[PDB]
């Protein structure tokens, strides 16, 4: 289990990793305008989901987690 959670935190880190690029780029274009008082949490979340459904990560992660064990 201690190896399993350790392998779980790596894929905890890996799947998070596109979204940190998303959270910074949304602040830069807002900072490119004079729009600095608005929080970008509202504008971060759409592009935080079309990068999930157009990528179709729901079938990519789930098939990827089960192919590690069984063979077809």
């Amino acid at each position: 289990a201690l190896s399993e959670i350790k392998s779980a935190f790596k894929i905890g880190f890996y799947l998070y990793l596109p979204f940190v690029v998303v959270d910074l780029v949304v602040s830069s274009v807002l900072l490119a305008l004079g729009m600095m008082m608005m929080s970008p949490v509202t504008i971060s979340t759409p592009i935080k989901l079309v990068l999930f459904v157009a990528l179709d990560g729901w079938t990519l992660l789930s098939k990827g987690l089960i192919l590690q064990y069984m063979d077809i």
């Binding site: 690029v21 780029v25 079309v50 990068l51 990560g57 990519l60 992660l61 990827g64």
Partner: protein
């Protein structure tokens, strides 16, 4: 600690260019609205490959 450094910097490598190139064009966004989404899946799919293997 073989791939943790690899994924640890190529996310930081993307934000120097993806956010740096709007600065150099300021010194039109409908044509740039299409190119911005094109790379983020190809980084997102590459990190999925080293995730689930």
């Amino acid at each position: 600690m073989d791939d943790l450094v690899f994924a640890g910097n190529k996310a930081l490598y993307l934000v120097l260019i993806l956010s740096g190139w709007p600065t150099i064009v300021a010194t039109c966004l409908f044509l740039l609205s299409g190119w911005y989404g094109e790379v983020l899946l190809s980084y997102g799919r590459q990190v999925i490959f080293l995730a689930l293997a």
